[PDB]
Amino acid sequence: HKSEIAHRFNDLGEKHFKGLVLVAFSQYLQQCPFEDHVKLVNEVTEFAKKCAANCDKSLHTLFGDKLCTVATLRATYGELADCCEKQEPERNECFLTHKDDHPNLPKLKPEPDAQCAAFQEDPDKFLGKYLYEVARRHPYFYGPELLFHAEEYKADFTECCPLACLIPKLDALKERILLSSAKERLKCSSFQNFGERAVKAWSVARLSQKFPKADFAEVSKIVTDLTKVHKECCHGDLLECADDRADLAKYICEHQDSISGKLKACCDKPLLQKSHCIAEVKEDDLPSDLPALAADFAEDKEICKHYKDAKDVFLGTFLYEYSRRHPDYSVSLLLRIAKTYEATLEKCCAEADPPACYRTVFDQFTPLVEEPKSLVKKNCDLFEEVGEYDFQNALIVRYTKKAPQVSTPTLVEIGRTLGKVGSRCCKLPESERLPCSENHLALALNRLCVLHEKTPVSEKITKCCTDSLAERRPCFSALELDEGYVPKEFKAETFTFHADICTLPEDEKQIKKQSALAELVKHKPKATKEQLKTVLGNFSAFVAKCCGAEDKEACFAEEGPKLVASSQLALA
């Protein structure tokens, strides 16, 4: 473009340009006050309009230059100021490395009266502050999807401001924010840790399941365009990302009839909704004219010639064909299946009669299928018997044993998120359980890996997190009690409760107890999951009793220590 900044300003319009520029700033500089970013947004914006009518400079150069003008940059961010000495793209790479995935910021609590009044004084300020608070908490959140979620947030406060209406809404928006963040974060982690080819393979598999009527050429086109979209978003180029995503939405809707019958609803919607709807679209019905795959991938005699000449395309075609007829499998299972297929051809094509060797290639897939089906059945059986909180506790025990070096807050977060997979997926129609469960486990394990990159503590986690992406869930599942762990010294304070727990909302009471559960496992790693449930059950009863007492602290003070000492002896 003659001037990229003006180009994007004209493509997106002023409102979304500023919005995406706000998100970008917030995610990069996570600790600056709201008002300082707004000022930088306006500066940049002013140059957009001057250029629309140094204009030659790329957005990165311009947006990175801007960032390095901020007040107190060395004091507030002692590494970022060093990034500023460097030129692009080195400089931006440097900014990205410093993005913080657990910036430890205050919980966002919906205050219906104080917030409803801010919006009235100034709606633009109020929506902008919202983009800011989520962006700095989720530095990799999918940019255009955040502007979409903010319009939902606008509809929440438009309907409910003239608490009973607003709290279950803002709580739900917040849950969709967490899931959506974890989805995008897995995309960005895949680029970073495994490269663009892993993102493509992932996308080929997922979009083939969604759009099984689409031909391979259409799937490849969409995958190529969407990988570029997410690559740009994951690299901080939010303006380009949004602009390219609107082009993709346009193409998909122009060809909705050959791509999928489920897209009709989506393509009659306004832009942001339209893109959101396509991204979340239900899978289309299986076409009746799906071809038999044995002929092209098992019975054909020139498979080795095809595999030799065009390895990436031949395999891509296998993955597209196998995935489109298997919306009942998870993406990572499909990717493990494609690896096994590739592995068969590699071995069989070296040997003397490959056709009699790769003739049974498809029967090597069936054991890959059985291991995740069993795990999903076993865990959904437990979920249904004991419910979410107790299921969460079983997983906290299971994972703390695998990785007792991991911080208690991390173990609790992950066990809680893993346990929520049961609530989401176990109730689903049964054929949708395996994909739902495993695709959502991949999100929670990625979160564990992301936290682990900055704060490494366990070589077992490093290995499962850095060996193949497709094997990550089976690697975690195969870990057992780390016997190299030295049990944590007992500290009474860790397991000592007070009456302050009583006033906490329910989810925060659970987190307190689950934190103690995690700590019990670290103290007695060999204790069975059954002994730990019993001990936690005695801690729960004690909290309930003393929170109902006339003199709560006296109750906590008297009953607290007995339960602390006796607990040690039940974990032997």
Side-chain angles (χ1 to χ4, degrees), residues 3-38 40-55 57-65 67-106 108 110-112 114-118 120 122-126 128-162 164-168 170-196 198-263 265-281 283-300 303-304 306-307 309-310 312-338 340-352 354-358 360-369 371-376 379-488 490-492 494-561 563-572:
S3 181
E4 186 172 9
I5 184 169
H7 178 61
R8 301 275 172 243
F9 188 81
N10 292 325
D11 281 15
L12 298 163
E14 190 178 349
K15 186 191 153 192
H16 291 164
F17 174 103
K18 300 194 84 156
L20 295 161
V21 175
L22 186 48
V23 173
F25 280 135
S26 300
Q27 293 173 322
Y28 274 70
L29 298 171
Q30 293 173 264
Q31 300 291 2
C32 276
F34 172 57
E35 283 77 17
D36 292 6
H37 287 137
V38 170
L40 285 197
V41 172
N42 291 343
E43 277 174 33
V44 161
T45 294
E46 278 197 293
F47 194 57
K49 309 186 175 149
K50 279 192 170 177
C51 288
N54 285 352
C55 288
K57 288 171 189 180
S58 53
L59 285 155
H60 255 158
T61 284
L62 288 161
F63 180 88
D65 282 5
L67 284 164
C68 298
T69 76
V70 184
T72 76
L73 193 67
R74 303 216 157 82
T76 317
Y77 317 93
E79 303 99 309
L80 290 188
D82 178 57
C83 294
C84 294
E85 315 217 288
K86 310 156 186 212
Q87 314 307 134
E88 296 283 2
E90 174 179 12
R91 183 174 72 184
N92 194 55
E93 286 282 304
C94 190
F95 274 95
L96 284 174
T97 297
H98 184 258
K99 274 190 182 187
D100 183 0
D101 295 292
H102 189 103
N104 205 41
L105 296 178
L108 301 158
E111 310 188 51
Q115 293 176 300
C116 273
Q120 278 141 3
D122 198 344
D124 291 332
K125 192 186 192 298
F126 189 69
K129 205 158 161 55
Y130 174 87
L131 298 180
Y132 163 79
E133 297 294 347
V134 188
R136 70 200 194 106
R137 275 170 191 77
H138 299 278
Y140 291 94
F141 200 105
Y142 191 18
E145 279 296 284
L146 190 48
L147 320 171
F148 165 89
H149 285 303
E151 306 213 356
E152 284 185 317
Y153 186 68
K154 195 177 172 185
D156 294 311
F157 281 82
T158 296
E159 177 189 333
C160 307
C161 294
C165 179
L166 204 61
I167 305 289
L170 293 178
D171 288 356
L173 175 64
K174 184 160 166 61
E175 189 86 348
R176 277 186 278 97
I177 289 285
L178 281 183
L179 182 76
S180 164
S181 186
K183 273 177 84 178
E184 196 57 23
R185 195 72 187 86
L186 174 59
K187 287 176 209 305
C188 304
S189 304
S190 308
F191 283 116
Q192 172 195 351
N193 291 125
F194 301 97
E196 171 162 359
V199 174
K200 287 193 181 171
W202 200 92
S203 287
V204 167
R206 191 73 189 95
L207 299 185
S208 303
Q209 296 178 311
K210 285 174 177 257
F211 303 146
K213 179 166 73 173
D215 61 48
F216 180 57
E218 288 162 328
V219 177
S220 304
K221 152 90 177 151
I222 293 164
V223 169
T224 289
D225 285 352
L226 188 61
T227 304
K228 198 167 159 282
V229 163
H230 288 293
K231 190 166 192 267
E232 291 165 347
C233 262
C234 294
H235 283 255
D237 304 323
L238 268 44
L239 297 166
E240 197 172 8
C241 166
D243 203 359
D244 289 331
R245 189 195 191 215
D247 295 349
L248 183 55
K250 181 196 161 182
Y251 167 82
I252 289 169
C253 291
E254 271 177 345
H255 299 73
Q256 61 170 311
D257 283 324
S258 45
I259 298 165
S260 171
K262 304 291 168 192
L263 285 169
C266 300
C267 296
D268 296 307
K269 291 191 166 209
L271 180 40
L272 288 176
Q273 281 101 313
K274 171 150 65 180
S275 296
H276 171 91
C277 184
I278 293 165
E280 290 312 313
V281 71
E283 303 155 340
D284 204 348
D285 298 313
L286 294 190
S288 49
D289 71 345
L290 285 170
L293 303 183
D296 285 329
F297 302 99
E299 306 170 337
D300 188 311
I303 283 186
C304 298
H306 308 319
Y307 178 53
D309 299 354
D312 297 289
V313 179
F314 190 67
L315 293 180
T317 313
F318 170 80
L319 182 52
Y320 156 78
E321 292 293 354
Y322 203 78
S323 303
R324 67 203 285 236
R325 77 203 57 232
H326 282 297
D328 63 337
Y329 295 170
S330 71
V331 173
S332 68
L333 170 59
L334 289 163
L335 292 182
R336 289 189 295 275
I337 286 160
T340 296
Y341 181 73
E342 176 181 11
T344 303
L345 304 193
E346 191 54 50
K347 188 175 64 59
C348 284
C349 289
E351 299 179 11
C357 183
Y358 61 77
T360 66
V361 66
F362 281 79
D363 293 338
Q364 318 318 317
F365 303 163
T366 61
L368 293 162
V369 176
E371 191 266 333
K373 286 248 187 176
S374 286
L375 173 84
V376 159
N379 286 285
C380 282
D381 282 345
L382 185 64
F383 174 71
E384 304 282 357
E385 182 199 333
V386 303
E388 179 181 281
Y389 162 75
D390 290 300
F391 181 51
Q392 284 175 335
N393 298 350
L395 300 161
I396 289 172
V397 178
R398 183 175 317 162
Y399 279 74
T400 299
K401 291 174 183 278
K402 295 166 192 294
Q405 309 90 347
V406 174
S407 74
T408 291
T410 291
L411 291 167
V412 172
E413 183 189 305
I414 300 312
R416 283 175 71 74
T417 307
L418 292 166
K420 282 192 282 284
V421 183
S423 314
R424 180 178 208 75
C425 307
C426 295
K427 76 199 188 202
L428 297 173
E430 284 80 12
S431 68
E432 299 166 9
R433 284 177 152 194
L434 156 54
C436 185
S437 301
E438 184 150 48
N439 299 339
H440 285 86
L441 290 179
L443 301 185
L445 296 172
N446 189 60
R447 173 59 176 171
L448 176 58
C449 299
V450 170
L451 286 169
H452 205 262
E453 281 169 27
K454 63 175 205 169
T455 312
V457 300
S458 163
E459 293 182 311
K460 289 175 192 287
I461 296 185
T462 294
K463 169 176 173 171
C464 291
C465 291
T466 66
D467 285 357
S468 71
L469 176 53
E471 294 284 4
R472 191 179 258 196
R473 201 283 303 147
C475 187
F476 277 99
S477 287
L479 298 170
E480 266 161 355
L481 169 54
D482 188 347
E483 284 170 283
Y485 188 65
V486 182
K488 199 157 161 185
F490 189 78
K491 317 163 215 167
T494 305
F495 306 105
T496 297
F497 294 95
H498 296 289
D500 64 320
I501 199 164
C502 310
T503 55
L504 292 180
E506 196 58 24
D507 68 313
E508 284 175 49
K509 273 190 184 67
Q510 293 177 348
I511 289 165
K512 292 291 199 179
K513 292 142 79 187
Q514 286 168 328
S515 294
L517 176 64
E519 291 290 342
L520 284 166
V521 174
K522 291 170 179 191
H523 175 47
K524 288 278 164 186
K526 282 169 156 39
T528 69
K529 70 178 179 286
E530 300 96 348
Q531 301 168 265
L532 291 152
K533 184 186 207 189
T534 289
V535 170
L536 186 66
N538 294 325
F539 275 107
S540 281
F542 150 61
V543 170
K545 181 172 67 168
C546 290
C547 288
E550 190 61 60
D551 187 351
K552 295 164 182 156
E553 191 50 55
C555 189
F556 279 96
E558 172 66 22
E559 302 286 298
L563 188 46
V564 172
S566 52
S567 284
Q568 288 160 282
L569 311 178
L571 300 183

